[PDB]
Amino acid sequence: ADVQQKLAELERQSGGRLGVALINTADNSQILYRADERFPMCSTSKVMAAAAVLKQSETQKQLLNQPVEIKPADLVNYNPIAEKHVNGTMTLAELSAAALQYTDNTAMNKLIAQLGGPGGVTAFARAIGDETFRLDRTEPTLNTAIPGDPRDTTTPRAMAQTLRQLTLGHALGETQRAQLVTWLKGNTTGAASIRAGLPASWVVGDKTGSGGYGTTNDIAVIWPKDRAPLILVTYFTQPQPKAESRRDVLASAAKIVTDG
Template structure:
């Protein structure tokens, strides 16, 4: 029954590998073409090995618009990657004069969200934070309470999604607060203040049976809310790069807030500004691991890259290896 439930959820997320490569979207440009044969050869076997999980992948040349995807039209849970469109929306509100970096928001008990959240951990000893600090905490620190404070101040998850749709980013959506999403996917009610802190929250999760957590995760994987397609995330980065979402100065600010590194397997001298999200699961139960960002090569070429891995029953190390090998394949395709 567990296998049936999991596979039912995965049918919504991804199904099989048939017809999973989307048509290439090409436009003229001065940059070299993607090595699509390499992508085909290297990434499809990784997707097959991740079954019953579903691997979603997309890469876009941000100059020419050339794109290659695997399961590019299928929806995957955003998890912490939601901080990227949220951060962009917050900067957009600042640029529009509807928010100010120095505006102070006060944390209430109802605003507290599950770990990781240094802001929740510090409450009630500290309750006041500037918008600037909250954007940093949400995007760089994956602070769930910072997410919720910003979303509420902007007008709610629906306001962020409406802003994205208005900017022609139609396949990325935010629907709920993190204090709702994270507990519900474990089988819990909305977050409570006495659950704050990693230890307390894990103890509450441990009070549920594996079957309860399995059922909650199956429902989470099948839920279209708070999801994105790989194609949608590529479009987000394209719009961000083109100045369609926020100004170029705002884009620079957002990208500087995203963690940057020279990830193993990527071309020498390249830097990857990216947001990673990992939702740990019980051994043998499905989890979520995402990585999305912009790869900048030594010669200045820039590529948006998105990797979503949902429903995998691999252990955490194997899931991380799948994502790392997918990113490495992407790096080899742009040499």
């Protein structure tokens, strides 16, 4: 079962462009497909923002408890948690969990503002060795996902390497690494994406993304039953602005790269 042929056969029937990077931590092996091409991150960028706030919390003792005001003018296009707290507050822990687990776009804008704007998220990426990631705009326009636009993009290779360092390596302090893994494992939005291509016994923490041009993304840490963890990035984007999501493509890509 040649994995490269199978990923090409999936892509050719998909109506889009597929990017895959798998890191198997049992042996540091990698499976790469368009892994050095740039894809729009969409909501998968929320992992870098939440991680940068966790890094801040290593030096600002009570940071995750700090209340942040939510005003009516802050609401954007998808605010399932933040709309409950308008003319009130959410803590930076609650905004981190809302952004990662509920993909709340207002919550992500508060994380970006806590970092000094999109460039502060990029700066944290650079501080942990990621030279590829770039965040350029706030929610919701960071999800436009226009083909060819470098704004708000990374590569599968870079994002897999970064996600390994954040969740399994030492980019964060041990308490903060554990909190990041707890949050990803509590994701509510992932079951139809990478997880749908894996056996029922395997444990996943992930962050999805979706945006214009049918962009459909997932980045995951995987704890397979009786195996060392995997990191898997699956990015997908389509040529028409109003294309439909294709989470099924991501599930198929995950099955192909884990079957062996």
